């Protein structure tokens, strides 16, 4: 395994061990999971706090002391902390670049100082995606999440078909290609129903996708495609949760920053310290309550929506 993917091999290896002659999903994790984590958090202040946690863990590494928490019964002296530091470094790099894209540092801290600028309220530099203007970005991020899910599931189905070709498993290769054909048919139907512009060839694409799906249904001689194409459609559409958790966290952080700014504005000279105190305690409380899902969702999107496509659990 390459050195840049070895820390994430620990992330994937908690599940079943892949059989001999099957593709291992280890290299997908370093490219996709920190990417999704960065897109979810998208906060420079949160990235800095995670960097502080990472340098604390690196201090634990260089002192060579075990990290023992009696409450959680967790013991990992050198190497698990080293791999966790590597994973956190990738995660905070993606978080920093996505926070740059979103124009968010500790929420809406750009309200006090116009460093980042919307076109209506300009600053020194513009914001590519506000992500708090839900009217101007909902479609722009729903389509991005849908495209990411389609790419992931299509890659999984292509890997399934390739494994079926490798192992001469006809009922397996036909299963993969039938899922792919049904998926392109459903995608063409959705595009025709929602955003149709060129319905001429799109109907033919729908027809050939359904034809491939039905042909693989009869050829594979397995009748589980009919209720499971619903599940593959749900797996494609389940990547909306990236933008969903990202918008929820960003709006919560912006609301904490906004109530802090309002408290500072009302009390004036004496309200700066109190507003900073309440904003800080709310920020660490919200992070303590909701930070774990921020890694849980991007890693589960690889755990179930991606691994089940190529038979990781069989």
């Amino acid at each position: 395994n390459p050195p840049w993917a070895k820390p994430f091999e620990l992330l994937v290896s908690f599940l079943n061990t892949p059989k001999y002659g099957t593709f291992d999903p280890t290299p997908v994790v370093p490219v996709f999971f920190p990417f999704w984590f960065g897109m979810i958090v998208g906060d420079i202040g949160y990235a800095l706090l995670f960097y502080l946690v990472g340098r604390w863990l690196s201090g634990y590494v260089k002192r060579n002391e075990p990290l023992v928490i009696d409450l959680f019964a967790l013991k990992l002296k050198p190497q698990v902390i080293g791999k966790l530091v590597h994973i956190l470094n990738w995660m905070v790099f993606w978080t920093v670049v996505w926070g740059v894209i979103y124009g968010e540092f500790f929420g809406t801290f750009l309200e006090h100082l116009g460093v980042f600028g919307t076109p209506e309220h300009p600053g020194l530099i513009p914001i590519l995606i506000h992500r708090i203007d839900t009217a101007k970005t909902a479609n722009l991020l729903i389509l991005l999440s849908v495209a990411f899910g389609v790419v992931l599931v299509f890659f999984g189905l292509a890997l399934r078909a390739y494994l079926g070709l490798k192992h001469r498993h006809m009922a397996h290769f036909w299963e993969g290609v039938g899922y792919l054909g049904g998926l392109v048919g459903v995608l063409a139907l959705a595009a025709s129903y929602l955003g149709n512009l060129q319905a001429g060839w799109l109907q033919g694409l729908m027809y050939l996708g359904f034809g491939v799906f039905l042909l693989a249904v009869l050829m594979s001689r397995i009748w589980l495609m009919i209720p499971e194409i619903f599940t593959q459609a749900g797996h494609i559409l389940s990547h909306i949760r990236i933008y969903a958790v990202g918008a929820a966290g960003g709006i919560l952080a912006g609301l904490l920053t906004d109530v802090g700014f309002a408290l500072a504005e009302r009390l004036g000279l004496l309200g700066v310290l109190l507003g900073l105190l309440v904003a800080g305690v709310l920020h660490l409380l919200i992070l303590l309550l909701t930070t774990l899902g921020h890694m849980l969702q991007p890693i589960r999107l690889l755990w179930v929506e991606f691994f089940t496509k190529f038979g990781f659990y069989e």
Binding site: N16, G234, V304, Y313
Partner: protein
């Protein structure tokens, strides 16, 4: 008139909320059984997770209906 916008919003809220309620109702028992199986064997992680996260399609398609209603706004 704002009657159409308001009642479409009510409809999509009802759809996504009741879909989430059904998904949670399923996931309660499925996740309890999965946690028991994990505590017993620890080799049941793939099957337990697959059974637990399978009924999320209900809330996914409730979200889909809500998005179509947003388009109808």
């Amino acid at each position: 008139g704002g009657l159409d916008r308001g009642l479409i919003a009510v409809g999509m809220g009802l759809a996504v909320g009741l879909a989430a309620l059904g998904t949670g109702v399923a996931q309660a028992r499925i996740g309890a059984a999965g946690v028991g199986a994990i505590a017993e064997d620890r080799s049941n992680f793939g099957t337990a997770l697959i059974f637990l996260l399978l009924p999320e399609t209900l809330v996914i398609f409730g979200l889909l209906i809500a998005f179509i209603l947003n388009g109808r706004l």
